[PDB]
């Protein structure tokens, strides 16, 4: 019996989708041929720009549509996994999972959300002897350490309450603050009595965390001192010896009933002046090394502080694909879509970004698998080390020493076929080794960052890290449980959203000019599907499509102002080509909507969000990347380019009416073509540039100004 079944599109919604895109190519090819024939539109310069710019979009669509070829849907069952592995005979044979939570500063991001995430991690519906949790704080702060201690104390009450009543979500902050009737399917007789006590307990706990957070607002002049009566080892944010501690472990705090709980490990890296420490890749690599020595597990799950587990069966759902003997043989990681809560019904800023996850990720899952996003991925431990998929021909102590590190325990740790303490040494030695294997200069002669684990370099290291793992023949899987199984927080204000988009664009640009560029990287040895390298090419060259986009957004104003002629008037042959072009985009979207399940509105918003993203963030990102590449922004500054097009288009397009109207006003329709084409650009970036800022909500009664002054300058001309 198969643990998971992978079925493609049911063939009723697939062939039409393939047949429309394949037809669109021929229509585009014929459309391009017709334009190239015409050599003149009263301005050779505009003709050169428009044809070149339009050609770029066609390649972008080609690089963007083929990856969506052959979408694949997957279904997973947990009962068979439990029946096959849990076994009434016992013991369970389920694989271990390690959770990584990364933090940087307690003040910038509240620790309550981090504490709620940690509580969610420990409540997974998985054997307690298997799952483990790791929390990493780049900036050693007493608030984070104390918050975990408080979180561990409250975990004694929270865990048994969650397990006995099987409540979901298991994060108290995101569970109690829910208006869904909590008495929906509960059958236990004493659910209400325990729930009322738990809600009282959580509120008391929430107060303690707030007191702890507010306490640390002022820093004592001498420095932080632990309760035992010793200084906190890290008193300087830029200098603190590596710290490792174990909380709520097997040998320690137990549950109120008397059971054990998943072990929580608090590890902080060692920072010293004069050394460069990477932001997230370094922390993840340190966690991987620590996890291997402390509790070597065959799978690693990475999560962010904001994100929390929403489905208690996520570990089982993730493990049913990875632990399947047949399909799980070659799987580097299992990607889970990131779903954001606390978002209005009308997602103005397209924060949920369902189009990418519900279209691209599902479509891209058909070739090899999705791309690493940064969270909700169950990485195979061997895959991170960079060995290569099993059942393949090809991917000494010195080689292991030069490939992994100097610590013999960690070197010997990876030799373990499954995972665990090799010779069950005393905890002190393992702790001492774990403290030693997080040295500041530990990764000096090693390949960490270069070819093993998380990859250093670009800001968006997640894309880079996934690319190298897939380059060695590994596969990834896409999971879409009925429940999200992973939820976090999305940006609320635009300043963070635009910075988020800019940061993604800058990282991709850095990848393009780095050695890890899909154009000339990974060709040697193959093992990468030719149809997936196109997706990587698309994912790395997408920012460059913005420069023609701004040019395409600039042609309507330049033409409509003086030239007023981009293409020759239709010769009774372009009408069908233009008609075929416009209809082609509509039909493909419907079929893509038909099988993907996304809503048309989100597609319009995503299409309406791509245009604004390209003009503003990518243009600066490409120029900044080009400037940085040559060398080796504010919310106000980021909005400068898009405003320029908004002003130029609106003044240009409207001025076209005035100058054209003062003219014979009989040779119009080209005005409509340029006006409508100008409307195309403005309508794409009008709702955001206006909506994203606006004053309060549309209805300003200020739109009359354009009518008057343009009717007044018209009156000045009329």
Ligand X SMILES: O=c1ccn([C@@H]2O[C@H](COP(=O)(O)OP(=O)(O)O[C@H]3O[C@H](CO)[C@@H](O)[C@H](O)[C@H]3O)[C@@H](O)[C@H]2O)c(=O)[nH]1
Ligand Y SMILES: OC[C@H]1O[C@@H](O[C@H]2[C@H](O)[C@@H](O)[C@H](O[C@H]3[C@H](O)[C@@H](O)[C@H](O[C@H]4[C@H](O)[C@@H](O)[C@H](O[C@H]5[C@H](O)[C@@H](O)[C@H](O)O[C@@H]5CO)O[C@@H]4CO)O[C@@H]3CO)O[C@@H]2CO)[C@H](O)[C@@H](O)[C@@H]1O
The interface region with a copy of itself, picked from 53-61, 73-81, 203-211, 237-245 by CB under 8 A, is 203-211
Q: Are strands 476-478 and 333-335 parallel, antiparallel or unpaired?
A: parallel
Which residue of the set 64, 138, 358, 365 is catalytic? 138
CA dist list (Å): 290 to 65, 267, 425, 639, 688:
42, 8, 16, 44, 46
Task: Confirm or reject binding of residue 89 to a copy of itself (CB under 8 A).
Answer: no
Q: Which among ligand X, ligand Y, a copy of itself, none contacts residue 102 (Cβ within 5 to 8 A by kind)?
A: ligand X
Residues 6+ apart with CB under 8 A from 179: none
Q: Stretches 140-148, 279-287, 404-412, 466-474: which one binds ligand X (CB under 6 A)? A: 279-287
Q: What character string, x for contact with ligand Y (CB under 6 A) and - otherwise, covers 601-620?
A: -----xx--x----------
The catalytically annotated residue of 64, 98, 462, 602 is: 462
Contact set for ligand X, span 100-119 (CB under 6 A): 102-104, 109
In angstroms, the CA 701 to CA 161 distance is 55
- The dihedrals phi and psi of 678, each to the nearest 5 degrees, come to -65, -40
Q: Contacting other proteins (CB under 8 A), which of 599, 637, 707, 712?
A: 599
Choose the binding region for ligand X from 98-106, 598-606, 674-682, 706-714 (rule: CB under 6 A): 98-106
Interface stretch with other proteins, choices 10-18, 140-148, 559-567, 593-601 (CB under 8 A): 593-601
Give the nearer residue to a copy of itself in terms of CB position, either 77 or 165: 165
Distance CA 334, CA 294 (A): 24
Return the number of the residue (163 or 280) whose C-beta is nearest ligand X.
280
Under rule CB under 6 A, residue 508 binds ligand Y: yes
Phi/psi of residue 702, nearest 5 degrees: -100, -10
Q: Does 510 bind ligand Y (CB under 6 A)?
A: no
> Does an H or E element contain 90, and which?
none
DSSP helix/strand/coil, 379:
strand
> Nearest Cα to 352, choosing from 101, 591, 606?
606
Q: Is 600 in the site for other proteins (CB under 8 A)?
A: yes
Separation in Å, CA 42 to CA 104, 559, 562, 563: 59, 10, 11, 7
CB 339 → other proteins: shortest distance, Å? 18
Residue 57 sits in the site that holds ligand Y (CB under 6 A): yes
Closer by beta carbon to other proteins, 520 or else 582: 582
Is 630 an interacting residue with respect to other proteins (CB under 8 A)? no
Work out what residue 285 binds among ligand Y, ligand X, a copy of itself, none; the CB cut-off runs from 5 to 8 Å by kind: none
Q: How far is the CB of 570 from other proteins (least distance, A)?
A: 9
Q: Is 575 in the site for other proteins (CB under 8 A)?
A: yes
299, β-bridge pairs: 97, 380
CB neighbour list of residue 562: distance below 8 Å, 6 or more residues apart: none
Q: Which structure tokens are listed for 96?
A: 């271990």
H-state helical runs in 337-480: 354-355, 362-364, 381-385, 397-403, 408-413, 427-436, 461-471
Which of the listed partners (ligand Y, ligand X, other proteins, none) does 304 bind, with a CB threshold of 5 to 8 Å by partner kind? ligand X
Could you count the other beta carbons within 10 Å of the beta carbon of residue 704?
A: 10
Under rule CB under 6 A, residue 349 binds ligand Y: no
Tokens of 191: 């659910």
Question: How do beta strands 243-247 and 97-103 pair?
Answer: unpaired
CA distance 253 to 233: 24
The runs of H, that is alpha helices, within 475-545 are: 494-513, 530-541
Single residue of 22, 83, 395, 579 touching other proteins by CB under 8 A: 579
Relative orientation angle of helices 640-662 and 670-691, to the nearest 10 degrees: 150
Decide whether 298 or 466 has the Cβ nearer to ligand X: 466
102 in a known ligand binding site: yes
User: Per the annotation, does 4 bind a ligand?
Assistant: no
Give yes or no: 138 in active site.
yes
> Which residues, 148 to 187, sit near a copy of itself by CB under 8 A?
183-187
Question: Closer to other proteins at the Cβ: 540 or 675?
Answer: 675
Write out the DSSP string of 2-41. -SEEEEE--STTTHHHHHHHHHHHHHHHHHHHHHHH---S
- CB nearer ligand Y, residue 268 or residue 476: 476
Asked if 421 and 449 touch (Cβ cutoff 8 Å), the reply is no
DSSP state of 349: T
532 binds ligand Y (CB under 6 A): no
Site string for ligand X, 365-394 (x = CB under 6 A): ---------xx-------------------
Judged by CB under 8 A, the stretch of 90-98, 472-480, 571-579, 690-698 that binds other proteins is 571-579
| Interface pick for a copy of itself out of 215, 634, 663, 698 (rule CB under 8 A) | 215
Distances (CA, A) of 15 to 20, 180, 360: 8, 41, 18
Please state the closest distance from residue 123 (CB atom) to a copy of itself, in A: 22
In the complex, the smallest distance separating the C-beta of residue 264 from ligand X, rounded to whole angstroms, is 18
For position 583 contacting other proteins by CB under 8 A, the verdict is yes
- 223-232 — which CB contacts under 8 Å span 24+ positions? 224/142, 226/142, 232/140, 232/142, 232/145
Residue 138 annotated as lining a ligand binding site: yes
137 tagged catalytic: no
**Residue 338 burial (CB < 10 Å; 0-12/13-18/19+)?**
buried
Task: Detail the residues annotated as belonging to a binding site.
Answer: 102, 108-109, 138, 279-280, 304, 503
User: Under the rule (CB under 8 A), what is the footprint of a copy of itself?
Assistant: 183-189, 191-192, 200, 203-204, 206-208, 210-211, 214-215
Catalytically active residues are 138, 462
Task: Detail the residues annotated as belonging to a binding site for UDP-alpha-D-glucose.
Answer: 102, 108-109, 138, 279-280, 304, 503
User: Under the rule (CB under 6 A), what is the footprint of ligand X?
Assistant: 102-104, 109, 138, 279-280, 283, 304-305, 374-375, 462, 500
Task: Detail the residues annotated as belonging to a binding site for Mn(2+).
Answer: 280, 304
């Amino acid at each position: 019996e198969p643990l998971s079944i992978v079925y493609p599109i049911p063939r009723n919604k697939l062939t039409p989708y393939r047949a429309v895109i394949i037809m669109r190519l021929i229509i585009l090819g014929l459309f391009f041929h017709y334009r190239i024939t015409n050599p003149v539109d009263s301005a050779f310069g505009l003709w050169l720009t428009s044809v070149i710019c339009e050609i770029w979009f066609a390649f972008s669509w080609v690089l963007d549509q083929f990856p969506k070829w052959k979408p694949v849907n997957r279904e997973t069952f947990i009962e068979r996994l439990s029946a096959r592995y849990e076994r009434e005979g016992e013991p369970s044979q389920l694989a271990a999972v390690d959770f990584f939570v990364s933090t940087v500063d307690p003040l910038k991001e509240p620790p309550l959300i981090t504490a709620n995430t940690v509580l969610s991690i420990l409540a997974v519906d998985y054997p307690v002897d298997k799952v483990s949790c790791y929390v990493s704080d780049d900036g050693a702060a007493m608030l984070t350490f104390e918050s975990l201690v408080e979180t561990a104390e409250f975990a004694r009450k929270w865990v048994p309450f969650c397990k006995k009543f099987s409540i979901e979500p298991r994060a108290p902050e995101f569970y109690f603050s829910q208006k869904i009737d909590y008495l929906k399917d509960k059958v236990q007789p004493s659910f209400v009595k325990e729930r009322r006590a738990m809600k009282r307990d959580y509120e008391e706990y929430k107060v303690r965390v707030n007191a702890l957070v507010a306490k640390a607002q002022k820093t004592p002049d001498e420095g932080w001192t632990m309760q035992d009566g010793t200084p906190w080892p890290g008193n300087n944010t830029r200098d603190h010896p590596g710290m490792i501690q174990v909380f709520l472990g097997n040998t320690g705090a137990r549950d109120i009933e008397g059971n054990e709980l998943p072990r929580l490990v608090y590890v902080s890296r060692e920072k010293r002046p004069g050394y460069q420490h990477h932001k997230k890749a370094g922390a993840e690599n340190a966690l991987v090394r620590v996890s291997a020595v402390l509790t070597n597990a065959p799978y690693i799950l990475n999560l962010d502080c904001d994100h929390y587990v929403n489905n208690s069966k996520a570990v089982r759902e993730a493990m049913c694909i990875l632990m399947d003997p047949q399909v799980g043989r070659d799987v580097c990681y299992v990607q889970f879509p990131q779903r954001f809560d606390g978002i209005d019904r009308s997602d103005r800023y397209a924060n949920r970004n369902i189009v990418f996850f519900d279209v691209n990720m599902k479509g891209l899952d058909g070739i090899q698998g999705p791309m690493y996003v940064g969270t909700g991925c169950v990485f195979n431990r061997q895959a991170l080390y960079g060995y290569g998929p099993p059942s393949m021909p090809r991917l000494s102590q010195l080689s292991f020493e030069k490939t992994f590190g100097l610590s013999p325990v960690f070197i010997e740790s990876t030799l373990m076929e499954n995972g665990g303490v090799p010779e069950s040494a005393n905890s002190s030695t393992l702790i001492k080794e774990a403290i030693h294997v997080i040295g500041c200069g530990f990764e000096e002669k090693t390949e960490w960052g270069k070819e093993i684990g998380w990859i250093y370099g670009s800001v968006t290291e997640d894309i880079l890290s996934g690319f190298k793992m897939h380059c060695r023949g590994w596969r990834s899987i896409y999971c879409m449980p009925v429940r999200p199984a992973f939820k976090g927080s999305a940006p609320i204000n635009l300043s963070d959203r635009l910075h988020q988009v800019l940061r993604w664009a800058l990282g991709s640009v850095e990848i393009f000019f780095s050695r890890h560029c899909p154009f000339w990287y990974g060709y040697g040895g193959g093992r990468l599907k030719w149809l997936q390298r196109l997706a990587y090419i698309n994912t790395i060259v997408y920012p460059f499509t913005s420069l023609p986009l701004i040019a395409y957004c600039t042609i309507p104003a330049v033409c409509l102002l003086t030239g007023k002629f981009i293409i020759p008037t239709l010769s009774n042959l372009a009408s069908m080509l233009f008609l075929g072009l416009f209809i082609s985009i509509i039909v493909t979207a419907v079929l893509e909507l038909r099988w993907s399940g996304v809503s048309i509105e989100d597609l319009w918003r995503n299409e309406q969000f791509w245009v604004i993203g390209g003009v503003s963030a990518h243009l600066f990102a490409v120029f900044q990347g080009f400037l940085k590449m040559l060398a080796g922004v504010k919310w106000t500054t980021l909005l400068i380019p898009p405003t320029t097009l908004l002003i130029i288009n609106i003044v240009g397009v409207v001025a076209g009416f005035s100058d054209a109207l003062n003219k014979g006003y009989e040779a119009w329709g080209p005005l409509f073509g340029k006006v409508f084409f100008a409307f195309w650009v403005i309508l794409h970036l009008y709702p955001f540039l206006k909506g994203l800022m606006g004053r309060q909500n549309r209805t300003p009664t200020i739109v009359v100004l354009w009518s008057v002054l343009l009717t007044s300058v018209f009156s000045l001309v009329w």
